[PDB]
Amino acid sequence: PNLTEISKKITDSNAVLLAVKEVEALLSSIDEIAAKAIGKKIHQNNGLDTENNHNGSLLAGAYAISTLIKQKLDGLKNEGLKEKIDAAKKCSETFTNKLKEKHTDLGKEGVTDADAKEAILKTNGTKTKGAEELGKLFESVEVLSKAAKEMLANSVKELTSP
Amino acid sequence: GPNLTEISKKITDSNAVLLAVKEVEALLSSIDEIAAKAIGKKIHQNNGLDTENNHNGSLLAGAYAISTLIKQKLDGLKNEGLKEKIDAAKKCSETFTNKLKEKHTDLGKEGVTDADAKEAILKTNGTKTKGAEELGKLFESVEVLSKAAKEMLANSVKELTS
Ligand SMILES: [Mg+2]
Numbered sequence A: 001p002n003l004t005e006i007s008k009k010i011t012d013s014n015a016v017l018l019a020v021k022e023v024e025a026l027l028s029s030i031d032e033i034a035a036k037a038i039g040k041k042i043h044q045n046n047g048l049d050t051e052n053n054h055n056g057s058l059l060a061g062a063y064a065i066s067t068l069i070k071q072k073l074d075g076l077k078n079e080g081l082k083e084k085i086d087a088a089k090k091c092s093e094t095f096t097n098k099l100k101e102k103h104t105d106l107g108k109e110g111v112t113d114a115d116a117k118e119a120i121l122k123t124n125g126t127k128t129k130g131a132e133e134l135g136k137l138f139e140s141v142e143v144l145s146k147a148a149k150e151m152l153a154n155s156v157k158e159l160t161s162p
Numbered sequence B: 001g002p003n004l005t006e007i008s009k010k011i012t013d014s015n016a017v018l019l020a021v022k023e024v025e026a027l028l029s030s031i032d033e034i035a036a037k038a039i040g041k042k043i044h045q046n047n048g049l050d051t052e053n054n055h056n057g058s059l060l061a062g063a064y065a066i067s068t069l070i071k072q073k074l075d076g077l078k079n080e081g082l083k084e085k086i087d088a089a090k091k092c093s094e095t096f097t098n099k100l101k102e103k104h105t106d107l108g109k110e111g112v113t114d115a116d117a118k119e120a121i122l123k124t125n126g127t128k129t130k131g132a133e134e135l136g137k138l139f140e141s142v143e144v145l146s147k148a149a150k151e152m153l154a155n156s157v158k159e160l161t162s
Helices: A005-036 A056-074 A082-101 A113-120 A131-159 B004-037 B057-075 B083-102 B114-121 B132-161
Strands: A040-043 A047-050 B041-044 B048-051
Touching: A005 A056, A005 A113, A005 A131, A005 B004, A005 B057, A005 B132, A040 B057, A040 B083, A047 B057, A056 A082, A056 A113, A056 B004, A056 B041, A056 B048, A056 B057, A082 A131, A082 B041, A113 A131, A131 B004, B004 B057, B004 B114, B004 B132, B057 B083, B057 B114, B083 B132, B114 B132
Parallel strands: none
Antiparallel strands: A040 A047, B041 B048
């Protein structure tokens, strides 16, 4: 085997994976705050305690993270994964735009827990304010993650295969 | 002659560690993103984010939630070589999370001022007496862990040509 080209093939696919994985983690943070921070507030002993319907700043954060995610996806350049990247970029804008569209419900300090959940809690009973689009975004990125993850393996399996 | 059998598992293993560390790094980036872009903001239908001062309570809840998640991820890291650098990050992670709880009087309510929020989660702010200082050190601890783990992968990949 050609240990020269395969080395740069592993280095390259790995770099791509890392980039994709970063977007994945950024998504995990939105899931974490949706599941743990909605309707909460810092508590000296238990970390988080109840504080209902003032989720505006928390939504703002989610939004900032979504635009950061969009930024990261646009930064991804890869021949092979190109089609799966554009799919993620598309769903990304859809999610970000739904939040903006729901500005009357999410664009204020006193955002209700119910509305917050409909915007960023992908496992909520109702997802009419963005959570639906978040759910699809996850799916899109996970697909891109699968591909990128395998390209790395394929490149690494050339060190022990014809 | 390079032992392509062991070197392959050496690359696969060190790479897994890197990803785990990189995820924590990314989660840290989300706290920086919301600190720099979401404090004192609210969703706006056209400009994405608009001014909405001093209602940073839910946003801080999110930050807290992300910090505990980070602690959770670091505790999951197991690696002989990086052990010491991991325990350093774990330590700083608790310090940060505990400073937030300690400042519950200022950060534990819906009406958290932009000034106080910046002192808790904006590592580049002039004053860092409510958590920012500790967040800065945490970043440093993780970046150090990132360096090491990033090189161990390089060293394992450079065995294919040395
Ligand atoms: Mg006010």
